[PDB]
Design a protein around this ligand. Structure first.
Ligand SMILES: Nc1ncnc2c1ncn2[C@@H]1O[C@H](COP(=O)(O)OP(=O)(O)O)[C@@H](O)[C@H]1O
Ligand SMILES: Nc1ncnc2c1ncn2[C@@H]1O[C@H](COP(=O)(O)OP(=O)(O)O)[C@@H](O)[C@H]1O
Lengths: 358, 358
């Protein structure tokens, strides 16, 4: 039992010596996987713009829509039904990275976002924006409805799903969540009922970063806890669905999910983040500096401008660290199919016309 | 030593139970890595075309060159020094996936090929072509010279280098090498000195594949053995560097490296292949059916044509299984900088003009 059981001895020596191999092999693999995913993201865009035309609700059966033409997968055209105007404006055709048909599904739209969730997990900053005139589809796209949840809820589910997988690869993740609203260039903490003076200040240990004073920050326990935090904030956003839409339809909602990945037994951390934004309505009548300046910032980033004026508004200043270089931005342009919206519609599609144009 | 050494007992049980985990984890990783690499390849092209202008040799110090302009990294322009002609043809400007300046290095050109070597290892078929008029740079690009080796030698080194890494991931690779020459629509086995009737026939167990009768096939032992097989074939290609260039400058050299990856303890094989081709000179005076038909095939593949006439020539028929769908093609357009070559030069760059044009 000495010169007989030595077989069940160095066996561990050979075993453990083979485990460490695989381990370092797997870690280097992930490394290469991560880098390839980013090359794909970089190749696909980094700042992409999608178009989404929503279908008419049941209660709008009698609301006239203009004529829509879907050219392939990324070009859409619309023509006023006003024969007078139509023959005085000429073709209204626009292209985007992708055009989502009114019959497209919520799942259809997440297929475009999910790859970016992985990026956040790899340490990249992501920004998802929903743009458009009040009633175009912004909130339905980000939040969705019970029988058809949108981006945010799908992000939570996928996020905790990937964090699980990461467990068997070393790496443990913590999610820090904040929820805020910007209305008239003033910030509001959607997780508190006691408002304080919230300001966007220069991070203490990084002149290039930022932090918001007096915002509630919760480190998420699990999916349900985040679902609750989200429902709480949605309920506190109390966007005037009753009276005075001048504050609901005129304010931005920003949800930030800071993702911190830690890997003990190999040191090194990984800090990423997901910024989901339900923007203020873009229709025409400060109250909309942030949205105006956000438009400038995005277009500027697209024109590879040497100097971007982020501090120009509350919203751009808040997302500055997530609009950087390696940062990835996804901008959904929500649009209504109604003729009485035509004017506001080309205005929205024209933004995307300033995008691909550069 | 029974209820005391049980610690060095189930330890292996826990150990081995943890190794299998990592293993399956690593295999699935590679899987994802492989798929990402292919999405990158697909996004970059699949059939790309590069341009390479060689510098004048020392013994050509007095050979007049036309004027060359390098626009960014992928657009080149040339203007005849004949003032009469220049003002009668208009701009000669072309774009490629990448333009290699006459000062570019052999390393510079391999950076474009190496990613494709990985693809072959992942089970994809790759084709590398060197195109151009006699003296433009074809052979120097593929073979190179002692102090500056080209593509082929770099492919061998990188190939055996990656095969080594694969060892610690399961997967064992065998390399099957063949070397042939096509001159007047006749095949020649470059590893034998006893010529037989070599024909391109329909593979026995796959109406869509092919095989060449009577070609020497060697399963490579190691890098040196392949280096030898290559030097043997290069020496047998005896391309008329003496007299009658009408057979050296008029024939194609094709080197195929069939890569078979086997993974015991997970079954499943992986068959890929690398086809390195030194084409026949494209200058003007059958003797060049293969090169003419190869041009048609490539352009057709680019135009996503429903039916490609591969059997139209010996060379296209031989590469048919490696010009398929998932197949990746890289075509280098070798070009001389001399004024006395101007005519043949736009002819070469114009091929690439039919490429990006579609
Ligand atoms: N794609 C769609 N499919 C079905 N209903 C939609 C769709 N898009 C929007 N809606 C509907 O209209 C409302 C969504 O508001 P939204 O247009 O997102 O806001 P705003 O444009 O003011 O930001 C929901 O009640 C929803 O039923
Ligand atoms: N990039 C280069 N740098 C230095 N010398 C070159 C270069 N390209 C071609 N050459 C030279 O000219 C010869 C190569 O032949 P090549 O032009 O490849 O053949 P063909 O165009 O007839 O297929 C070599 O002897 C080499 O010295």
């Amino acid at each position: 039992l000495r010169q007989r059981t030595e077989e069940l001895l160095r066996c561990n020596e050979q075993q453990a010596a083979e485990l460490e191999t695989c381990k370092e092999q797997l870690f280097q693999s992930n490394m290469e996987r991560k880098e390839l995913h980013n090359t794909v993201m970089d190749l696909r865009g980094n700042i992409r713009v999608f178009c989404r035309i929503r279908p008419p609700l049941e209660s709008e059966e009698n609301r006239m829509c203009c004529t829509w033409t879907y050219h392939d997968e990324s070009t859409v055209e619309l023509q006023s039904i006003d024969a007078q105007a139509k023959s005085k404006m000429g073709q209204q055709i626009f292209s985007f990275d992708q055009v989502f048909h009114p019959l497209s599904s919520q799942s259809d739209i997440f297929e475009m976002v999910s790859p970016l969730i992985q990026s956040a997990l790899d340490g990249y900053n992501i920004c998802i924006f929903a743009y458009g005139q009040t009633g175009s589809g912004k909130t339905y796209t980000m939040d969705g409805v019970p029988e058809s949840v949108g981006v945010i809820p799908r992000t939570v589910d996928l996020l905790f799903d990937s964090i699980r997988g990461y467990r068997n690869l070393g790496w443990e993740y913590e999610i820090k969540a904040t929820f805020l609203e910007i209305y008239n260039e003033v910030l509001y903490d959607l997780l508190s009922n006691e408002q304080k003076d919230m300001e966007i200040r220069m991070a203490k240990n990084n002149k290039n970063d930022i932090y918001v004073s007096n915002i509630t920050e919760e480190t998420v326990l699990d999916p349900n806890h985040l679902r609750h935090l989200m429902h709480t904030a949605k309920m506190n956003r109390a966007t005037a669905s009753t009276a005075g839409n001048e504050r609901s339809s005129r304010s931005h909602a920003v949800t930030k999910l800071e993702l911190i990945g830690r890997h003990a037994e190999k040191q090194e951390i990984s800090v990423g983040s997901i910024n989901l934004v339900d923007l203020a309505g873009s229709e025409s009548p400060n109250i909309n500096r942030s949205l105006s300046e956000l438009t400038n910032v995005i277009l500027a980033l697209l024109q590879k401008q040497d100097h971007i004026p982020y501090r120009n508004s509350k919203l751009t200043h808040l997302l500055m660290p997530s609009l950087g270089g390696n940062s990835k931005t996804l901008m959904f342009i929500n649009v209504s199919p109604f003729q009485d919206c035509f004017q506001e519609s080309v205005k929205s599609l024209r933004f995307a016309a300033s995008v691909n144009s550069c």
